[PDB]
Amino acid sequence: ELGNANFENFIGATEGFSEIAYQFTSHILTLGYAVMLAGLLYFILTIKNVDKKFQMSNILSAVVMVSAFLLLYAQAQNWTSSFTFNEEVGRYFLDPSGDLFNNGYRYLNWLIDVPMLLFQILFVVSLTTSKFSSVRNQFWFSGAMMIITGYIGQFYEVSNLTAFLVWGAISSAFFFHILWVMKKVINEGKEGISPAGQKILSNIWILFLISWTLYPGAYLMPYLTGVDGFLYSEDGVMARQLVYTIADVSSKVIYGVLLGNLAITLSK
Amino acid sequence: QELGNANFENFIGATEGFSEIAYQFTSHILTLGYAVMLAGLLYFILTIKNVDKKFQMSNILSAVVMVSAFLLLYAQAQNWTSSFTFNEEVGRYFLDPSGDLFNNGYRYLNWLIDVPMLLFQILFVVSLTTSKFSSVRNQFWFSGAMMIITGYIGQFYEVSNLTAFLVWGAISSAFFFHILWVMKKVINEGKEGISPAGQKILSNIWILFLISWTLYPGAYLMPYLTGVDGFLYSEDGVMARQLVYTIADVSSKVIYGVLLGNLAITLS
Amino acid sequence: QELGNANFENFIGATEGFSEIAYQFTSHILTLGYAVMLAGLLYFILTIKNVDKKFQMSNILSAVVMVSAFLLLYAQAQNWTSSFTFNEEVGRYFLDPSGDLFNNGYRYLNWLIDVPMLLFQILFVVSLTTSKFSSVRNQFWFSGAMMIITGYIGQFYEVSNLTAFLVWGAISSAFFFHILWVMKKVINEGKEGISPAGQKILSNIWILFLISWTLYPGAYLMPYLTGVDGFLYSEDGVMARQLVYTIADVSSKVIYGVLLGNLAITLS
Amino acid sequence: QELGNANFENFIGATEGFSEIAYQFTSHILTLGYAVMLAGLLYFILTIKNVDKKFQMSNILSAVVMVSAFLLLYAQAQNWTSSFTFNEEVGRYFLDPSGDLFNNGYRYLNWLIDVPMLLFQILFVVSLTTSKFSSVRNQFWFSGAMMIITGYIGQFYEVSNLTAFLVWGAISSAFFFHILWVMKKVINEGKEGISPAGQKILSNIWILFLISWTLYPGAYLMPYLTGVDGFLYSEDGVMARQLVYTIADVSSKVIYGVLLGNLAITLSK
Amino acid sequence: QELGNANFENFIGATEGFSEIAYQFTSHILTLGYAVMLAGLLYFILTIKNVDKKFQMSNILSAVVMVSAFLLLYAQAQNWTSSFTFNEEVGRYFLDPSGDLFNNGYRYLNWLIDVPMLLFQILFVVSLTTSKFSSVRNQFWFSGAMMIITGYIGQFYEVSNLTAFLVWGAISSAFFFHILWVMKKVINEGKEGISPAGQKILSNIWILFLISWTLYPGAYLMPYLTGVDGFLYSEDGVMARQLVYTIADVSSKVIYGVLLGNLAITLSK
Numbered sequence A: 001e002l003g004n005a006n007f008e009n010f011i012g013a014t015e016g017f018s019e020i021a022y023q024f025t026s027h028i029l030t031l032g033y034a035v036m037l038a039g040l041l042y043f044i045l046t047i048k049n050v051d052k053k054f055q056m057s058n059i060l061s062a063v064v065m066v067s068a069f070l071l072l073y074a075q076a077q078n079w080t081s082s083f084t085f086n087e088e089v090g091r092y093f094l095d096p097s098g099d100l101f102n103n104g105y106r107y108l109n110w111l112i113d114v115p116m117l118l119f120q121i122l123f124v125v126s127l128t129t130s131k132f133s134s135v136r137n138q139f140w141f142s143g144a145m146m147i148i149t150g151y152i153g154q155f156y157e158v159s160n161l162t163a164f165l166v167w168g169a170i171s172s173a174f175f176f177h178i179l180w181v182m183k184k185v186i187n188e189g190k191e192g193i194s195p196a197g198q199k200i201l202s203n204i205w206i207l208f209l210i211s212w213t214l215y216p217g218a219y220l221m222p223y224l225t226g227v228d229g230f231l232y233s234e235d236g237v238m239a240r241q242l243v244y245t246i247a248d249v250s251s252k253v254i255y256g257v258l259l260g261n262l263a264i265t266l267s268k
Numbered sequence B, C: 001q002e003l004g005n006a007n008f009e010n011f012i013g014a015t016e017g018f019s020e021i022a023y024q025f026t027s028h029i030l031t032l033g034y035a036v037m038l039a040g041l042l043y044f045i046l047t048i049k050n051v052d053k054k055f056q057m058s059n060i061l062s063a064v065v066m067v068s069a070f071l072l073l074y075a076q077a078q079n080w081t082s083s084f085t086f087n088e089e090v091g092r093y094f095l096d097p098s099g100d101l102f103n104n105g106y107r108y109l110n111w112l113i114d115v116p117m118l119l120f121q122i123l124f125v126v127s128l129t130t131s132k133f134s135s136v137r138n139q140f141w142f143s144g145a146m147m148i149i150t151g152y153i154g155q156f157y158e159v160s161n162l163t164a165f166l167v168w169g170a171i172s173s174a175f176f177f178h179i180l181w182v183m184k185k186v187i188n189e190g191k192e193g194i195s196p197a198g199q200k201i202l203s204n205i206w207i208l209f210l211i212s213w214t215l216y217p218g219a220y221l222m223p224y225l226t227g228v229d230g231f232l233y234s235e236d237g238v239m240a241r242q243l244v245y246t247i248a249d250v251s252s253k254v255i256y257g258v259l260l261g262n263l264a265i266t267l268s
Numbered sequence D, E: 001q002e003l004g005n006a007n008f009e010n011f012i013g014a015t016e017g018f019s020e021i022a023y024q025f026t027s028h029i030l031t032l033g034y035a036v037m038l039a040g041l042l043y044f045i046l047t048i049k050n051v052d053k054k055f056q057m058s059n060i061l062s063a064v065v066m067v068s069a070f071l072l073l074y075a076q077a078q079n080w081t082s083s084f085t086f087n088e089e090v091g092r093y094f095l096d097p098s099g100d101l102f103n104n105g106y107r108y109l110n111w112l113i114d115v116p117m118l119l120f121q122i123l124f125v126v127s128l129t130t131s132k133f134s135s136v137r138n139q140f141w142f143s144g145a146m147m148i149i150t151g152y153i154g155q156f157y158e159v160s161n162l163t164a165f166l167v168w169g170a171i172s173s174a175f176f177f178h179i180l181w182v183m184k185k186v187i188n189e190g191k192e193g194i195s196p197a198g199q200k201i202l203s204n205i206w207i208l209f210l211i212s213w214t215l216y217p218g219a220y221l222m223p224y225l226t227g228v229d230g231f232l233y234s235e236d237g238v239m240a241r242q243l244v245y246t247i248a249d250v251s252s253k254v255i256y257g258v259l260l261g262n263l264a265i266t267l268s269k
């Protein structure tokens, strides 16, 4: 009787995880939080490389990094404490004394990362039609609604598939609003800067789109091959956490590095 | 089973147990709390040289608070996960005494750091007119100490003795109202003789102070706000209490320090 | 149930056990202690550039002390929670030998850092007149070392051998009085030739030093301050001992360093 | 008992067990590794202002690597101590499955930080002549990623499937040789137009790079370097593997960064 | 309970066990050690700008040793408390194998950081006259490595094979005497051409070096300094060994760095 639990727990409590699956999930989470701490150091040590009016961006990047390290460190431990080896079969099964594994740790902490990540670009690009405050408030409201609806939804990814999908769609609405506003921001920021900055901004747009789209992909991962599909297995757990790590790295570290390069180019 | 003078979370977890949603949400919200606290430390450290020297003390005090907050919430997070263990037969988290009983007093005593410093730092940005700096500081510190100590005594009896619970709560509320009075005086005097932007910032600071500080007696009273054997005397009440604690912590510490720093910038 | 040369906390916890209030309060007070120490470390680092170069050593030494203090009070906190475990049948925390016996001598040996450095740092702010710097330093260090070592030997027999307890305590008290004499000389010489404000600060420093340092033999004698089988030979005595330890730690380290820094500012 | 696609440390520890020397030495060497990494982090941060601004990026990248290394090695240290428990009846440490199986893959994925950055940072000290900066960088990054991923896949089968082990190892060795080729090109171009002292430093850097990076496939092959049922298919092989890992880590990260910093110093004005 | 090539602390704790005073004191002394190391790290970082630039390297290298030391002592502290558990029936702490056996080798390998760096940093303050910098450095590093490695091999047999114990100890003592010789030469050359105050500081540094470094073979021999089945082959010997280790660590690292910094200040303009 698992109740409103994530599907990792069902897979681990029925079939269990082979050595490769368990060890790979642990390794990918470890790499995630290591990347986050290294990026924190990188952003702190490069603050004076940009003009003062851009250093805020750097700071915010650092801020984000802090949150992520702590989460992906906790989450990491969580994984290894939720599943233990059974010598009789050679697989890792759910160990209830280490609690049920839950991805929600990431959702609430996005309440830090999503606003901040949306906010810092407004310290590097210059708006030509929109108001700074209006864009900021839209970003924050839509991100909060998206995160909260998705966080409520993921609790029912096995118990109540209907609620899962409904909350996912209600979240995707705010996601589309965020995407529209961000495209507006980047198009307005391209105006009046050298072609190098425009190239950096187009790269930022592409990276933003892909890496941010990766997250609902991980949301739906156990069902992307339908019920009782190839992805509703330990392969799906591996894929979920791998996509999470890729999207984390891209949307945080690489995004901050491209913002820093843009700030360097715009600096005098 | 005999629990003695323990918080109502322990009683709920020993009788009904917690569902996956309740337990996981409480853990996530405490994790988010301490993550927010360490990211603000960096923020407040990294933005020290953004204000005139005379205001920088505020920043320092903010950082101090952050440290305290982080540590406490980190500890508190761990304590939660160690006090409740999954029971597979029914699929619910029950009290685990080998991990010690859960107690909110960890917050209360640590407020002995937070409450004075928070009340102290505003006196490094605004300039008093008819009030005396040392008088305001001593009143703040004495009233805060009394409030914290009386509430800390009272919360131990939230289940074992409702009468002492309420009596200590009222005794604490007296000092709380005194603090609100002195703070209103301080804000009104600080408004005198400053720019309109600083006046708007001070108004926002007063509103934030009022709401976020009132949230704490709300969390104190949470299990009984729907009466004896009411709806909030459940795992829903535990979730609500920790959520209110986290919202109040973030608002009264991080956002309060950020608004104070904005005020310091406009005055520079 | 033979405990040997163990502290009286272990005897109380092995015979009567601790109630929820007693155990939780001891844990909270130790947690507050180490939080205060880390916050003080941050404060003393951040306020280094507030005084002239010649005084900055004081800050550094303060920070040094903080480090030591933090680590021990963090360790000691852990030790408390690991040494006593909840018994559900009666609802009380009893001695848990798998977590090791509780011992307060961790503090003693760590005073081998604190006592010299604290006594040393005042010699970087005040200017001696008739006394020799190196003589004062050597007297401070030797007397402090002897005091700490003799008290550390004595505290192991606070239950198993009252005679050794009291004899070693008196041997320590001799060196304590020597330290008090030398400190009075140092403060009186430092008052000479400075402004009245610095003299008032020095008087406050002397009062604080006296009270806060006298608090330590008080915690040493705590279980017997009401006689054998007295009121304090209970969990109440355990609470009182750890509370006195925390008050003395905060006063003699953090507030002492803050007053020294204020003096350094007035002398700058 | 069934272990599946697990490293050979688990098989040795589950069948023969480890003596006190083997277990204690492995723990000590991993501890020394992560201690060295943290000390190097401190060093590279503290010596940033010792070189001209244009070279300071190198320092930063070193520090970045250090962080990764420290964290990873720290975890791995814990993992060792969690996988093997003393049995008083025989006097040997045996596999403890409640602590998870021991796996070297923690290193491999973390090389996804180490290998690019290490290859990247030298491009902030030396000046290329005929090669394009971005071309060299992209080649380094792609070849390193492929090498790491293929070796990481291969090492899971070092006991359960020797054929896949060797095939993935060879596929990885291809990209390793490409990396060596590009690095030799970089060193030859960097020697041009700098003082003889900097050229000597570059020669030492090339020798160190070659040896220290070649040490890693050696640790990959360690249990079989004396054949099946050989001398190295024992606790001696486990000790040798972790010792080679630690020596290669120190040499290829800390000493590499120190030599790069000395080169940057001689090039500074 | 067969323990094999294990340190004598495990034998004492497995046969007689430790009393409350002995166990608590060993734990306190290790805790004090790592606390001292972290505080010294803070001190050496915060006092960097107190000396001329050319001397600041000393400061840096001191903090590197403080990092290493800190980590090791922290680990060792944990290890002690994890290896011995209270038995309520008799009131003594006995060996607990689930926490691993206690081993001092953690220190030894970490000396591979401490011993070279400590010997290196003095060469950033004093100026040699007749000796060559690189020759002194190479001699220091080689002799220190050999000393550490031979003693590390030997200490595993302090109970199981006293003969190998003593043979490895003597082989190590040879390199120790070589180090003392080179250090005496270095101090004599550094005294030349500096003010009398710096010469007095150098004399004090030499005395400190001699005593604090000689303390380590003392801890090596501690259980047998009173003969076979002597007084020191007891829990008293365990306390004495760890206390000597802590005193030697503090003296040879923190106080050594402080005296070096004082010398650097007196040499500073």
Ligand SMILES: *C/C=C(C)/C=C/C=C(C)/C=C/C1=C(C)CCCC1(C)C
Pocket: B111, B114, B115, B118, B147, B148, B150, B151, B152, B169, B172, B173, B176, B213, B214, B216, B217, B220, B249, B252, B253
């Ligand atoms: C960061 C923490 C802050 C600002 C804490 C503030 C605490 C209070 C306003 C305490 C309030 C209390 C009462 C008014 C009544 C009941 C008891 C208390 C202690 C919760």
Ligand SMILES: *C/C=C(C)/C=C/C=C(C)/C=C/C1=C(C)CCCC1(C)C
Pocket: C111, C114, C115, C118, C147, C148, C150, C151, C152, C169, C172, C173, C176, C213, C214, C216, C217, C220, C249, C252, C253
């Ligand atoms: C930060 C720690 C400080 C300032 C410690 C001070 C310690 C003392 C004043 C020690 C006092 C002792 C006695 C005078 C008698 C009994 C034994 C002692 C060691 C507790």
Ligand SMILES: *C/C=C(C)/C=C/C=C(C)/C=C/C1=C(C)CCCC1(C)C
Pocket: D111, D114, D115, D118, D147, D148, D150, D151, D152, D169, D172, D173, D176, D213, D214, D216, D217, D220, D249, D252, D253
């Ligand atoms: C700090 C870590 C570094 C520099 C890692 C370097 C890694 C390699 C040179 C990897 C080599 C591999 C092969 C050449 C063959 C077998 C598989 C590998 C992954 C071990």
Ligand SMILES: *C/C=C(C)/C=C/C=C(C)/C=C/C1=C(C)CCCC1(C)C
Pocket: E111, E114, E115, E118, E147, E148, E150, E151, E152, E169, E172, E173, E176, E213, E214, E216, E217, E220, E249, E252, E253
């Ligand atoms: C911080 C650590 C230091 C300075 C360590 C120094 C180590 C030694 C002087 C080692 C000495 C040894 C011998 C002289 C003989 C026996 C074996 C050793 C390794 C303990």
Ligand SMILES: CCCCCCCCCCCCCCCCCCCC
Pocket: C137, C138, C139, C141, C142, C145, C146, C149
């Ligand atoms: C130039 C520096 C002069 C230093 C002055 C004296 C400071 C060192 C004092 C060391 C005290 C050591 C006391 C330990 C003695 C052994 C105790 C056994 C129990 C009585």
Ligand code: NA
Pocket: A079, A080, A081, A082, A083, A084, A085, D098, D099, D100
């Ligand atoms: Na596990």
Ligand code: NA
Pocket: A097, A098, A099, B080, B081, B082, B083, B084, B085, B086
């Ligand atoms: Na739990």
Ligand code: NA
Pocket: B098, B099, B100, C080, C081, C082, C083, C084, C085, C086
């Ligand atoms: Na406990």
Ligand code: NA
Pocket: D080, D081, D082, D083, D084, D085, D086, E098, E099, E100
């Ligand atoms: Na183990």
Ligand code: NA
Pocket: C098, C099, C100, E080, E081, E082, E083, E084, E085, E086
């Ligand atoms: Na223990």
